Design a binder for this molecule. Structure first.
Ligand code: ATP
Ligand code: ADP
Ligand code: ADP
Ligand code: ADP
Ligand code: MG
Lengths: 281, 97, 1544
């Protein structure tokens, strides 16, 4: 049972759902509980003097703001959700979230398209850390964009390939995908001409018939003269294995940015670690 | 007339976008052209070794991020920013080519 | 608790059952039940009315038992009525858009369809009425607002289906069917028009005239889509010759036919059809060019799939599903809803991008969220897409009152009907409300997703989402859209769960160049591309070059305004040319007229009529340079509106204004008035921005009257101060319990105009919002000022703005309004240079010469006086030069030209009254012209000095006097050193010093330091005369100065000379609201309904009420820089009245005036007053008396006090010097910078003299050493009690010894200044000094009795406790003696106060604060204390702690209680009568006979002042004290502050 907190009737539903679930054993989720900090203290007192069913679980999705009561934070297990630390971690999160049966379907070329979608989503999202350079503003390139992009790939690939086991790379609707991703799914949040120009550059570079060749380069001149190579696999398991074998040496040259874009950020964070290590002495 | 031959820092002006319009108006008024049919051409030269014609305005303080301008041509560089010595904003008629 | 509920339930149910006489035909069983209930109600009235006594009816059995049965019956039938409404709403779901009361109106008026014609607007998109035959039994068709009508193929009669719902269902079904059949015929004809080399204009125009504006555009789109699809299919072979060029050729030749058609004159309905066809065919031409350029040869290529394609299937049995509209992979079916004639939109690339993203979201069964700055085209694009698919799009202007319940009913209505909802300003909702709504949106979307699954069948149960604890059917056409402007003020943040439910899209840069080119092309402008390439860069350059002003807006809305104005001007110019062609010769050719038309000149005229009026003075040359540069070689001269100008001449002359043409005086103002007229013609939303006193109000008032006498249409203006009332009172409120909508102020005004019981649409209505503008209240008008011209309320009601109503705002600045509001209103800028000083001078002289002052010898005096000041009221005259110099001085408040002139005119009006009084006092010898000339000339200089420099210190008053003396020619006083400000003008006409009006009086011994005793000084007599002049004119005035300077004393002294004025004291605080003034109005005034309207006047006939606001600048400013009470006061001063929110009726004030007092705005907690409020109120600066004045003021007081003991009479002079010197040093040493409570004023000196006098009153003889000890003791209790740090107390102790020894050399130091200075009247009868050891033993014995009778906690007695109990005892023995104890908790502040209160016989009262304690409980506790101490004459020591303040309302009532002794709004209703009964009974016990309620309340107030003592205890917080200095100012000037602190 999912209840959105914020209204008077929402509080009554939350009380009724919790009271029903502690005996029946179902799950109850309350969204945006940080908008009712006063009611959260009442919830914590109710939870403490309670012995619910074995299978009962309560989820409280919230934004990280100081209005949340301290007692509630101590009484529950905290999970922090944020953009993944790196390209390798972002792709791994994308592949795990997408069901295995969705990637492996009638066209064998569907698996490669999801990998390009996973790589494109990772490159776009991790350029946000270098906000002045990677983009022009902190866009909310989130999981909702990935879901819409995956649905678009599913819809158009099925339209072009009517259940055929194999579809030629040239027959894949590259223009249909590139236009929709740059105008509806990811281009909707872009409010600048140069950000839109940058977004078109990535989509045209990635989503093309040459992405199915063995010599395709995801990124060029990452360090020295080496470059990222497109995997030669054709199944989902092969692509996930390639992601797990990433060098774990990510630099802004992976995203196309100059290698010195992270020099300031890494210096500030490194200095910040010293202060944090000093503040708890 | 002297106010045309001075080089201004676009970062040092309260409304730098007004200066571009003012230079655009001055060129069109001098040549009896129209405002809507003037385009901007940029020529980067040294501050001391530069000549300003009837349509060129000098601009200083512009910083090029991640690129170097040599002989009015850009090249990718690993420097954070490169200071352009002097920028000449030249207004010429639109060609639509 | 049962009779009232049953009475109310029967009342509205009877009206429902009586108003709807046909409700019984559909509700048979309950009608019989109600008839039985009605019979019971008639029986009840026939039994209870016979005996008009509650006792006579309570003894009758069977009453309560039948009442309970009646209550159950009333509830049961009401529930059955509710179940019937929802059941009937289920069929014909369009009834979800009408209210319950409106729905019953439709239910009961099924027989007559005339009453039903006014509701079809709000159930249908474009159906404004239904066409019926003469019998009113057969619905022939439907009609739109523009006059276009649709005739049904098979008319729906009402006789076969009298059921309102069933035949209302059929007309909706018939309208869709007849629109489908008409479209099928239209596409057949346009297919013949297509695939043709040439198109005959006669045939094409006939087809356009035949079909509706919605079907002609749709037919063109269908034909083009089929032609391209066929051409692409033929080209599918690849590498083939292209017939797609023929499709482009067919569009171009049809475009040429359309382009020539709009050139000639056309009927207005045909012209709109011509414009829509041009707009679409231009889009088709652009798309076909794109397809040809990209060499697209496949019908499945995405360059063609991304375009919107229309497919028509004539073989389909269902006509409703015949047409399918597809974009990318999204497929939609045309809804066939009659949209009337809407305004199409140029399909710019961004609009296309908007169509693709929105249609992608709809296919995914989730809403679309276009966002960006205002004016981009979000709402219109959303509406255009809905009209493109034939959907019913509802636009809602969301705001904070759109709570969870309000939105749920809107979603329920949309789901049942299957409509589209465009929720503009979605982020204006509360963040918690945005989160709650995300659940309803999610539930609707999931239901839609399961609807789209192919497994589901129409035969299977319909998809029903749970909305508001009910199963609501969800139509597959249901959709949600939420436009938003992120980053704007007054907007919330959407929660992440809500944001994932919408597909966002950035709408930031509209294609202005294309929108214009097509708009100009469709309007008949040849070379539209040239004009578009010139007008769009012009607006971009204007945004860059022009200065950044808060009211500037050069976005798409401005370009659109220009383009629409460009079309109107060209049509007018063609008509003017045609009228010239008929008079001169007879040759008329529309082709020639369009050929030699100066299209560039027309465009410049529209720019000058729209963009110029809002330009500031410095920006006008820049724009005109841009116009000449962008449009070279062409110039435009504005037409001389001679017809209106003559009307302006007559109206200005009759309202005593100045009129001028061009460069004459008043010329700039008239151009501003004419610009306002032009903005009115093209805009339905106006703003008049400009500094206060720039002629804005006179501009639109004169224009309204000039238009009335010119066009013959009567003008009615409703002036509303938006910020003087809460937003709930302005627009309305929705009850969270009963869901009943109570109309606000603006809503009631707009609804009254729409209904027009008294012919309102036939008159020019201007709703003027004269007040500050912020995004809190003005964004609710966004949909009104937008094209929607619709006012949307949370209850779902939508009010259309009538064409004769103009929404105008009169503001001084727009520094807080968002860009959304700025772009929605035509702006007129009134600079201060518009209204020159000569313009105001002529108005004053004209009014002086015409309007008599009394209500004629009075007028003759004014005319003679006006001629005398005439030379001095000219440009570069005495007044103008003095006014210019006065702007260079420093004033305690910001100086405005109209404030100085407003004060000056009032003084000169008093001068004329002074002359008449002299004439009345000397009937035989009236004052001659020579004496009048001398008196007026001298009084003018005197008035100038006190008007331009009244609110400045002594140095600036001298500076202006010196400057005046250099420039005037009026004879001036010849004193070498004494300033002119020291002289008055006698009625005889000579200068007389103010020192002659000040005598050295001898105050009576028993009246020493009395509250009503004022020692006259130079500053006292000057301000008393100044206040007399302003008060006699009933002009509001404000006294500014530091606390204790004598603002209240001067006003009360001045009011003593006016016996017709009664002063009412109001104490403002930071939480003050207009409710405080309204409570005072209820107590002291009454509402009566005169024929001219409601009038509020004081109950005391013939007496003027003077509302004295103690701290006028203290009320807190909101986050938009506005004080609500100040805006309230400004309304009742400028407009002479306010709005009663009970029934939205204008209440006009009579015999009421205001007087304000305030500390300087630089003091902490004080906000500067608004310039629009300071315009009406003169400000007089009452400063601290000087050392010479203080010696004179308190030297007289000391001489009178020391007359008690003749032996000490020779020490009056040195003693006064000692008090003055020490007070000056303490004032300098301790300032408000250190602590907030370090305020020293002459009030301390007055308390000093009163303290010494009370100690010396009973003593027969006392030596000099005794007097010094009393002097030293009073110094400690006044200057040392409030000190915080121990070092400050040591400074006071040391300097007291130094000051006393300096002025009293030969005294015994140890006898007079023994450090333990203690005084008490406990050991003896008199207030003699006491020994510490003897005092300690006495307190020990008294504490022992205290334990036995009262609180039994033991106390440890130390020197501080003995000192503290003495200080507390001092306060308790005084009238209105309140205490403020500040110290750490647990220091004994409460236990000492209770002990001392028990010692003095006071009864201790403490409020028992618990968790459920609220404002009502505190008022009851306050009223219990006031009743006990005011009616029963019981002395009460009200002890209250800081922790007892649970709300800001707690302090406000205490703030009024401390200063005035009575809360005006505390006793209202029945309890006021009981209080008066006890007050009369209490007065009888004392021995006074009181009859009227007015005198009884004064006795009650005096008793509470004398008896009630308030002890306030609080912790010594640093910031907490500073906040308390503003929220409760009475705590720091009405309460004696004692700093106990922590134990030393
Ligand atoms: N045409 C005119 N001729 C003479 N006097 C004029 C004229 N127009 C305005 N005035 C005078 O100037 C003042 C204008 O007051 P008005 O209330 O119209 O100004 P405003 O700018 O709307 O004020 P506010 O900003 O306080 O609402 C008045 O004293 C009025 O008599
Ligand atoms: N494509 C367009 N063609 C013509 N006029 C347009 C177009 N888009 C918006 N407009 C105009 O923009 C003005 C403001 O509407 P809009 O920008 O939709 O408001 P908002 O930004 O509040 O949603 C209206 O006059 C509207 O007709
Ligand atoms: N000329 C004067 N004669 C006698 N008392 C004066 C004179 N001027 C000032 N005072 C004293 O100063 C005090 C003025 O306080 P008040 O007018 O209430 O200050 P505010 O108006 O700022 O609240 C009075 O108590 C009065 O005794
Ligand atoms: N002079 C004193 N000697 C002994 N005990 C004291 C003294 N003053 C206060 N107390 C203690 O403080 C308690 C009451 O505190 P109270 O006066 O209510 O604190 P506050 O002054 O903050 O209101 C009593 O129980 C008493 O024991
Ligand atoms: Mg005004």
């Amino acid at each position: 049972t999912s209840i959105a907190i914020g209204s008077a009737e929402g509080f009554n539903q939350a009380d009724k759902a919790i009271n029903t679930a502690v005996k029946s054993g179902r799950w109850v989720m309350l969204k945006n509980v940080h908008l009712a900090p006063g009611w959260l203290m009442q919830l914590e007192k109710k939870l403490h003097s309670l012995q619910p069913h074995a299978c009962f679980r309560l989820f409280l999705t919230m934004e990280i703001n100081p209005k949340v009561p301290v007692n509630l934070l101590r009484a529950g297990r905290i999970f922090v959700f944020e953009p993944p630390p790196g390209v390798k971690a972002n792709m791994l999160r994308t592949f795990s979230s997408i069901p295995v049966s969705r990637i492996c379907k009638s066209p064998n070329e569907r698996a490669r398209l999801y990998f390009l979608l996973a790589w494109f989503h990772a490159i776009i999202q991790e350029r946000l850390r270098y906000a002045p350079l990677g983009w022009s503003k902190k866009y909310e390139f989130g999981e909702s964009d990935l879901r819409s992009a995956c649905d678009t790939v599913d819809t158009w690939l099925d339209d072009t390939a009517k259940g055929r086991q194999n579809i030629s790379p040239d027959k894949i609707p590259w223009s249909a995908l590139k236009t929709l991703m740059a105008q509806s799914i990811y281009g909707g949040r872009v409010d600048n001409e140069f950000d839109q120009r940058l977004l078109n550059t990535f989509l045209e570079r990635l989503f093309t018939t040459r992405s199915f060749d063995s010599e395709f380069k995801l990124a060029c001149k990452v360090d020295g003269h080496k470059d990222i190579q497109m995997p030669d696999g054709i199944r989902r398991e092969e692509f996930v294995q390639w992601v797990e074998l990433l060098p774990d040496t990510q630099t802004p040259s992976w995203l196309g940015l100059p290698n010195n874009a992270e020099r300031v950020l890494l210096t500030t964070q490194g200095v910040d670690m010293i202060s944090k290590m000093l503040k708890m002495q | 007339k002297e106010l045309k031959n001075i080089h201004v820092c676009l970062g040092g002006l309260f409304v730098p976008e007004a200066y571009i319009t003012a230079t655009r108006q001055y060129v069109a008024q001098a040549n009896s052209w129209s405002l809507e049919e003037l385009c901007l051409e940029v020529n980067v030269t040294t501050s001391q070794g530069a000549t300003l014609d009837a349509c060129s305005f000098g601009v200083t303080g512009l910083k090029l991020q991640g690129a170097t301008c040599n002989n009015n041509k850009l090249s990718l560089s690993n420097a954070i920013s490169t200071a352009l010595p002097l920028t000449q904003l030249r207004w010429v008629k639109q060609t639509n080519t | 608790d049962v009779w009232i509920d049953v009475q109310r339930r029967w009342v509205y149910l009877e009206g429902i059952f009586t108003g709807s006489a046909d409700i019984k035909h559909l509700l048979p069983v309950e009608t019989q039940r109600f008839q039985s209930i009605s019979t019971e109600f008639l029986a009840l009235m026939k039994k209870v009315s016979k005996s008009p006594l509650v006792m006579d009816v309570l003894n009758i059995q069977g009453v309560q038992r039948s009442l309970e049965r009646l209550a159950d019956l009333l509830g049961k039938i009401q529930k059955a009525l509710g179940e019937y409404l929802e059941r009937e709403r289920s069929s014909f779901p369009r009834f979800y858009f009408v209210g319950d009361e409106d729905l019953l109106e439709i239910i009961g008026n099924s027989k007559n369809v005339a009453k039903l014609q006014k509701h079809f607007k709000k159930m249908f998109a474009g159906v404004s009425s239904i066409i019926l035959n003469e019998d009113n039994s057969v619905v022939l068709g439907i009609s739109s607002r523009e006059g276009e009508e649709v005739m049904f193929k098979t008319p729906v009669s009402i006789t076969e289906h009298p059921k309102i719902n069933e035949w209302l269902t059929l007309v909706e079904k018939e309208m869709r069917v007849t629109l489908a059949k008409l479209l099928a015929e239209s596409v057949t004809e346009v297919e013949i028009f297509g695939k043709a080399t040439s198109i005959d204009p006669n045939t094409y125009i006939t087809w356009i005239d035949k079909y509706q504006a919605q079907l002609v555009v749709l037919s063109a789109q269908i034909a083009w889509s089929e032609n391209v699809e066929t051409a692409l299919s033929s080209m599918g072979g690849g590498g083939d010759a292209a017939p797609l060029h023929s499709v482009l050729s067919n569009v171009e030749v049809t475009l040429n036919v359309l382009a020539d058609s709009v050139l000639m004159e056309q009927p207005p309905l045909r012209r709109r059809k011509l414009e829509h066809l041009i707009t679409e065919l231009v889009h088709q031409r652009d798309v076909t060019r794109s397809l040809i350029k990209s060499k697209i040869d496949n019908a499945k290529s995405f360059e063609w799939l991304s375009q919107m394609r229309f497919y028509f299937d004539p073989k389909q049995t269902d006509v409703l599903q015949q047409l399918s509209i597809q974009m990318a992979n999204a497929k939609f079916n045309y809804g066939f809803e009659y949209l009337g004639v809407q305004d199409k939109l140029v399909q710019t690339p961004l609009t296309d991008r908007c169509y693709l993203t929105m249609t992608q979201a709809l296919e995914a069964r989730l809403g679309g969220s276009p966002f960006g700055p205002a004016g981009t085209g979000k709402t219109e694009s959303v509406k255009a897409l809905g009209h493109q698919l034939g959907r019913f799009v509802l636009v809602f202007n969301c705001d904070e009152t759109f709570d969870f319940q309000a939105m749920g009913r809107i979603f329920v209505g949309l789901c049942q009907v299957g409509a589209w909802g465009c929720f503009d300003e979605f982020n204006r909702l509360e963040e918690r409300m945005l989160s709650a709504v995300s659940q309803q949106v999610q539930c609707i979307q999931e239901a839609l997703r399961e609807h789209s699954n192919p497994n589901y069948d129409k035969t299977s149960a319909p998809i029903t989402c749970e909305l508001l604890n009910k199963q609501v059917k969800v139509s597959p056409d249901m959709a949600i859209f939420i436009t938003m402007n992120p980053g704007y003020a007054g907007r919330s943040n959407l929660p992440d769960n809500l944001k994932k439910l919408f597909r966002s899209l950035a709408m930031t840069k509209p294609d202005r160049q294309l929108i214009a080119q097509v708009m100009l092309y469709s309007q008949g402008f040849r070379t539209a591309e040239v004009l578009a390439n010139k007008i769009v860069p012009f607006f971009k350059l204007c945004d860059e070059q022009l200065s950044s002003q808060s009211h500037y807006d050069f976005g798409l809305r401005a370009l659109k305004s220009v383009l629409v104005s460009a079309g109107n001007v060209k049509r007018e110019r063609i008509q003017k040319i045609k009228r010239e062609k008929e008079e001169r010769g007879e040759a008329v050719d529309e082709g020639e007229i369009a050929e030699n038309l100066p299209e560039q000149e027309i465009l410049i005229q529209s720019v000058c009529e729209t963009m110029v009026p809002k330009l500031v003075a410095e920006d006008i040359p820049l724009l005109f340079s841009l116009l000449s540069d962008v449009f070279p070689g062409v110039q435009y001269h504005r037409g001389e509106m001679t017809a209106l100008r003559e009307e302006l001449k007559k109206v200005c002359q009759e309202m005593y204004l100045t009129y001028g043409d061009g460069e004459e005086v008043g010329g700039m103002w008239v151009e501003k008035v004419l610009q306002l007229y032009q903005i009115t013609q093209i805009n339905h939303g106006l703003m008049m921005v400009g500094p206060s006193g720039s002629g804005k109000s006179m501009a639109w008032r004169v224009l309204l009257k000039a238009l009335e006498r010119l066009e013959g249409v009567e003008g009615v203006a409703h002036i509303i101060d938006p910020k003087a009332i809460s937003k709930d009172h302005l627009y309305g409120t929705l009850d969270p319990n009963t869901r009943e909508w109570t109309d606000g102020l603006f809503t009631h005004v707009l609804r009254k105009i729409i209904d027009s019981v008294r012919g309102e649409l036939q008159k020019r209505q201007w709703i003027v919002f004269d007040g500050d503008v912020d995004p809190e209240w003005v964004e609710n008008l966004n949909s009104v000022l937008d094209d929607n011209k619709l006012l949307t309320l949370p209850n779902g009601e939508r009010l259309s703005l009538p064409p004769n109503v103009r929404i105008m705002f009169e503001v001084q600045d727009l520094k807080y309004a968002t860009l959304a509001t700025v772009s929605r209103c035509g702006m007129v800028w009134f600079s201060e240079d518009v209204l020159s000083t000569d313009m105001i001078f002529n108005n004053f002289l004209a009014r002086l010469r015409s309007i008599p002052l009394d209500e004629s010898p009075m007028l003759q005096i004014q005319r003679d006086a006006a001629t005398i000041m005439q030379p001095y009221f000219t440009s570069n005259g005495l007044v103008t030069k003095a006014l210019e110099h006065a702007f260079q001085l420093e004033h305690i408040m910001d100086l405005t030209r109209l404030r100085c002139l407003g004060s000056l005119f009032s003084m000169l009006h008093q001068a004329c009254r002074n002359v008449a009084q002299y004439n009345a006092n000397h009937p035989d010898f009236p004052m001659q012209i020579e004496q009048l000339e001398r008196y007026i000339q001298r009084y003018l200089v005197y008035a100038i000095l006190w008007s331009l420099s009244g609110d400045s210190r002594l140095k600036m008053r001298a500076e202006l006097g010196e400057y005046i003396r250099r420039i005037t020619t009026v004879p001036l006083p010849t004193a070498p050193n004494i300033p002119i400000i020291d002289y008055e003008v006698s009625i005889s006409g000579e200068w007389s010093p103010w020192q002659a009006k000040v005598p050295q009086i001898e105050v009576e011994t028993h009246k020493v330091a009395a509250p009503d005793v004022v020692v006259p000084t130079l500053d006292t007599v000057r301000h008393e005369a100044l206040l007399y002049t302003w008060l006699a004119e009933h002009k509001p005035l404000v006294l500014c100065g530091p606390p204790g300077s004598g603002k209240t004393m001067t006003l009360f002294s001045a009011l003593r000379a006016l016996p017709d004025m009664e002063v009412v004291g109001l104490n403002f605080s930071s939480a003050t609201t207009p409710e405080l003034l309204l409570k005072t109005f209820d107590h002291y005034c009454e509402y009566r309904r005169t024929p001219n309207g409601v009038v509020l006047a004081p109950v005391q006939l013939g007496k003027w009420l003077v509302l004295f606001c103690d701290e006028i600048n203290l009320p807190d400013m909101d986050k938009y820089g506005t004080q609500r009470v100040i805006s309230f006061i400004r309304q009742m001063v400028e407009h002479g009245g306010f709005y009663r929110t009970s029934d939205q009726t204008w209440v006009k004030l009579e015999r009421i005036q205001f007087v304000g007092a305030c500390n300087p705005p630089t003091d902490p907690g004080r906000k500067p007053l608004s310039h629009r409020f300071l315009r009406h109120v003169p400000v007089v600066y009452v400063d601290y008396p000087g050392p010479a004045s203080l010696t004179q003021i308190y030297g007289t007081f000391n001489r009178a006090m020391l007359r008690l003991i003749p032996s000490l009479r020779t020490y009056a002079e040195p003693l006064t010097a000692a008090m003055v010197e020490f007070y000056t040093m303490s004032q300098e040493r301790f300032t408000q910078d250190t602590q907030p409570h370090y305020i020293y004023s002459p009030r301390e000196m007055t308390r000093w003299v009163r303290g010494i006098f009370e100690a010396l009153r009973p003593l027969e003889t006392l030596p000099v050493e005794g007097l010094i000890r009393i002097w030293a003791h009073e110094a400690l209790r006044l200057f040392q009690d409030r000190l915080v740090e121990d070092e400050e107390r040591r400074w006071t102790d040391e300097n007291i010894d130094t000051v006393a020894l300096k002025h009293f050399p030969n005294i015994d130091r140890e006898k007079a200044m023994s450090r333990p200075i203690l005084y008490s009247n406990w050991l003896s009868k008199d207030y003699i000094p006491v020994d510490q050891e003897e005092l300690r033993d006495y307190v020990k014995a008294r504490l022992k009795v205290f334990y036995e009778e009262e609180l039994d906690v033991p106390l440890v007695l130390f020197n501080e406790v003995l000192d503290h109990v003495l200080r507390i005892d001092r306060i308790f023995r005084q009238p209105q003696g309140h205490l403020l104890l500040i110290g750490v908790s647990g220091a004994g502040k409460t236990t000492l106060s209770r002990f001392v209160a028990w010692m003095n016989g006071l009864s201790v009262y403490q409020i028992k604060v618990h968790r459920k304690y609220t404002g009502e409980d505190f008022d009851e506790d306050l009223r219990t204390v006031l009743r006990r101490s005011g009616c029963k004459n019981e002395k009460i020591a009200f002890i209250m702690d800081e922790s007892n303040v649970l709300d800001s309302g707690f302090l406000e009532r205490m703030n009024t209680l401390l200063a005035n002794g009575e809360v005006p709004g505390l006793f209202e209703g029945d309890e006021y009568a009981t209080l008066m009964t006890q007050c009369k009974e209490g007065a009888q016990k004392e021995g006074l006979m009181l009859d009227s309620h007015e005198e009884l309340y004064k006795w009650f107030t005096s008793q509470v002042i004398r008896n009630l003592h308030v002890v306030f205890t609080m912790n010594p917080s640093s910031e907490g004290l500073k906040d308390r200095a503003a929220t409760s100012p009475a705590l720091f000037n009405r309460c004696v502050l004692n700093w106990f602190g922590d134990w030393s």
